[PDB]
Amino acid sequence: NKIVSHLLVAEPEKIYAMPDPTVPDSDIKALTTLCDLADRELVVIIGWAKHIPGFSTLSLADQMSLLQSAWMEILILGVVYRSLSFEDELVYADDYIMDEDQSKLAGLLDLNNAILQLVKKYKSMKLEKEEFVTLKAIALANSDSMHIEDVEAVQKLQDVLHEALQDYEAGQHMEDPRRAGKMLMTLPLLRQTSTKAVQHFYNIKLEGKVPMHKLFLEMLEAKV
């Protein structure tokens, strides 16, 4: 399927967390590192979205609305995917892998446990890269922004990506004629986990102890 092949080639290079080796380990260090990484990933996500067939033909306001609604789901899906061959650890980046103990220290035990639940589900389904990239695009298109100008164009973008998923599954997974639907049925937990992450980091923002860069702040403010 061509849309799937295109999404695979459009998949961005990974980036490094680069935690500051001169700074003592603390909750503030961990959270600063993650927020800094997210800020840089957000730049990469914006560039990636322009490769999705039809996205750039939407008005700028609608492009903004989709990204404002979906950004954390896209970030989370990336962590989930990188974590699939790991056990009880989350690969935020190749140089930043959080186990349970580190999650507790960062005050992220509940959030990271929910992300691990998504990992566990996809592990059991043997999620493939083809399926990952297609679901990332579907999460963007299906992000439920209240502010869409051209609802019919957004529905068509949803349709295009949904068709690519169904087609991929029909060709590659004849053994399970419901596999496309099972993939779509993982989106509620992704949405739930994203909401949790957004609310947690917004609280962190309000508390004022973790410095945050401007893009990350902009995207956080737009969501709450």
Binding site: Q63, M219, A222
Partner: peptide, 10 residues
């Protein structure tokens, strides 16, 4: 404005 800037960029 930053999201908008980046969407317009390159």
């Amino acid at each position: 404005s930053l999201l908008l800037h980046l969407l317009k960029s390159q």
